[model samples]
Target chain A: RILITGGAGFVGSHLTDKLMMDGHEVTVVDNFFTGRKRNVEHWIGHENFELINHDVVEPLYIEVDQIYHLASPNPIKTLKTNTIGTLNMLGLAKRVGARLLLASTSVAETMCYAYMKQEGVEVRVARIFNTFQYVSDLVNGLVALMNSNVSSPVNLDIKKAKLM
Target chain B: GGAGFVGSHLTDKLMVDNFFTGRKRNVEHWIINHDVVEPLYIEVDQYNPIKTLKTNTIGTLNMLGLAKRVGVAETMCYAYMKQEGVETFGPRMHMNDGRVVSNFILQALQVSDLVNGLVALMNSNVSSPVNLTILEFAQLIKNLVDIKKAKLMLGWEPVVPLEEGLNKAIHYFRKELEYQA
Candidate 1:
């Protein structure tokens, strides 16, 4: 199963759609800061989908095998969600023996790489470039692109994403 | 630790609308102290990159510290993954899913079946290789995880594609839409 924070937002909703369709139980965590219930309301009754109107700012506790920390739309939200939120999710990953896939701009993705790698936490970091593209992997978390840090950073891009 | 009537109630309902402004008070009120057995973390889009760094880094210290004090195996360490494939695909094919995460979605949208390869050097089990930038990964799924050390350790060099994964997803949505109608 998986805990997808912001799983009802643009990229997140798509991730949720794909995972639920794949027969995995998905718990979506969204404060609806930018995400909408309408995006994921369709899966309300599906066995593989569960929606939670929660923010990652504080801390989340769930028995999950994976977490997609996609909270966004503002600086404060980004900071806390990315920082403390990353901590909470990694902590949960440690306690439950789960593999974590982190997606972020190159900076935060790098932070995840540095902090979470000291103890062999099963993790993957994807450094996504500029794009309106929502094509990201949720199961493993955006195996999208990188530069040197597979654990370092993967610079994934078509020529178009290079514009940014 | 972090689970109760008021806390869960808040998380379920009241924990909405700008929860980040002073999220600590509410979180404290709801959850005092908590620790998990084994949890996984995935970092997606964060609002502020600085905050992302602070949270993941500092929060990671706390988890690692606790893991050491508590004797949780491999809790503080991590293994970054590597992908091996250069064959790019169209949008339809790009989102069709893969061996590691590729299950069932839509086959019609995609055509090519160039599977990617992936590897992860576990930091806990062995000294980490190096960290620089994303490079390799994507082979097959083993209970949702694909690893470079996977083959020798688990005795499998996994490989799967997206046609079935995506094709089924298209159908799932089709049935969903039909049922919703």
Candidate 2:
């Protein structure tokens, strides 16, 4: 089973589609700030999928093998969601022994490293550089990072043509 | 929970001689009943990171917007006050939490002293970040801060020594344990 925090956004919806296709039980938790239900509405009734209208800033208690920590949009909300939201996800991951993939911005390399070093939480950070014209490529990169053994922060700009 | 330790002490320092109803008598002087997460009329606004983040970020924003509409002396207190979480303390000194202050004094400073520093900082003109020497355990197991800036700029420093603070905290906790018992 896998969980996606902002599983209804542009990148998240795409990632959700790919993960569901892979036959993984997917739980999508979103506050719907910018995420529309219609983005992942097609999988609403599917047995492998669950939609939770919850903000990730609040602690979420659920069991899953992995978590895609992606719940964020606005500036202040972004900072809060990323900092504390990520902390909550880290806590959850620590509790359940789940690995987390943070959809991080290009500049937040140290931020991800801080959690990894300080908290001892198993973390994979994809430093998104936004070169992917196609969303599938980004989704694939995220999946690749999640499945890979490497836990260090990796640059995910397609222009670099780097893959693990 | 505002009727409890730090909340009550902070309330005592805010003595607004206007109007206020409190559900608990801790703030009977103010007589106010409202939550920080919820929007208040003139106002402003943590254990859960959600509530803490929301109150600090959203609640602070709410107060800032309110102040913008009808301004006041402004100073934002960042993540200085610790959030209460799953603290498991039994009748023992060897608590699982490895915080030096936690094991040392159970706290670093009295809430009143901290509040006084807060009020001093609020009244001061300094806009830079100031270290409170207080702490966070889960995030940082070991840490310390120099209070030279607080002393030099705001003329603020903890009046309570570490030993005295710890003694008082131990006394209060002992009473609390008895009360709970």
Candidate 3:
């Protein structure tokens, strides 16, 4: 069994889906701090996927062969997830004796790598740089361009504008 | 490595000694050069041994001369120091190994260039009295090296106080290297 923390988040959700499709038994743990429940709603009843709403700030007991620790907040987020989250996960990894993979950004990964080296845990940190993907923004823009009705520019425009 | 507080102190000491000793009329500049070489051994059929040697020597000389002329410095000779139980290479290339190597090399080159430039600037000015002690300067270089993995090099100066610097370095090493074990 593979454990994925923050499995309902943007990157984590995508990773969770991919792992489930790849025929792996995936257990996703998330506190929904930044993760949306709807992200994993499609896989709700899937036998291969298990979603747990839990925070890594507390100790978690589980049996797993591998752990993908990805439960950290972004820079703009209010919560200080890095320090507390990392400490908790490190403790968990130490207890389980499982090989851990940390999905860390370049800047964060450098520090994580150093910390992991000191911890005596055989871990791998993925220093991901700028990763771009095509979302639905382009489609929305094109739809607005085609619907050139001056008075009614479409409710989708107002929705996107408000969200932005 | 050479340009740390120790190197800076050494530079100053060298300058003061030069002035007092009166070896030259004026101490205009000092040039410090650091070099690193990696020897690669490959099995050959012996038919092209002479050709290979000639090519290797010429290529090495050319690259070394160019690097010197361009003021390039190399670092990370000691990256593979702590290889306890981890695999150095595996199916997926060890990302940490590459990051460690790259970080060390980049930092050393940057620090070398900064120190070299400062020395050059001091040489050109020649008016103010520059003071540096060998011990203090060596501590500085060590400090800079430790900045990435240990502590601030300035915290390790012996003249300032051995206990203080040692304690700081120990604290830093503890924080940074504790997980390695």
Q: What share of the true interface contacts does each candidate keep?
A: 0.18, 0.00, 0.00
Better model by lDDT, 1 or 2? 2
Q: What tens-digit string does per-residue lDDT give for candidate 3 at A49-131?
A: 88898887567888776677778753312123554465456567777775566665532243344445565555655433334
True-structure lDDT of candidate 2: 0.66
Which regions in candidate 3 have their CA more than 4 angstroms from the true location? A74-79, A107-119, A133-164, B1-132, B135-181
RMSD of 1: 24.5
Worst 10 residues of 2 chain B by lDDT: B80-89
**What would the per-residue lDDT of candidate 3 be over residues B43-112, giving only the tens digit for each residue?**
3221333223323332343333343344301111111112211111111112234444323322432322
Instruction: Report the C-alpha displacement of residue B154, candidate 2, in angstroms.
Output: 13
lDDT of 2 by residue, A30-134 (tens): 999989999999999999999999987788999999999887772445555665577678778878988888888772334445556665667788877664457
Ranking by DockQ: 1, 2, 3
TM-scores for chain A, candidates in order?
A: 0.79, 0.89, 0.69
Judging by lDDT, tell me the better candidate of 2 and 3. Answer: 2
**Highest-scoring model, lDDT:** 2
Per-model TM against the reference? 0.43, 0.51, 0.39
Quantify how close model 3 is to the true structure by its C-alpha RMSD in Å: 23.2
**A1-164 in candidate 1: lDDT tens per residue?**
88787888877888788778878899998888877899899999988888987777567778987776666652323444665666777667777877776766644455465545554666666555554443553323362322113454444443432332
All candidates: interface RMSD: 13.6, 10.8, 21.5
Off by over 4 Å in 1: A134-150, A157-164, B1-181
TM-score of chain B of each: 0.31, 0.58, 0.21
Worst 10 residues of 3 chain B by lDDT: B72-81
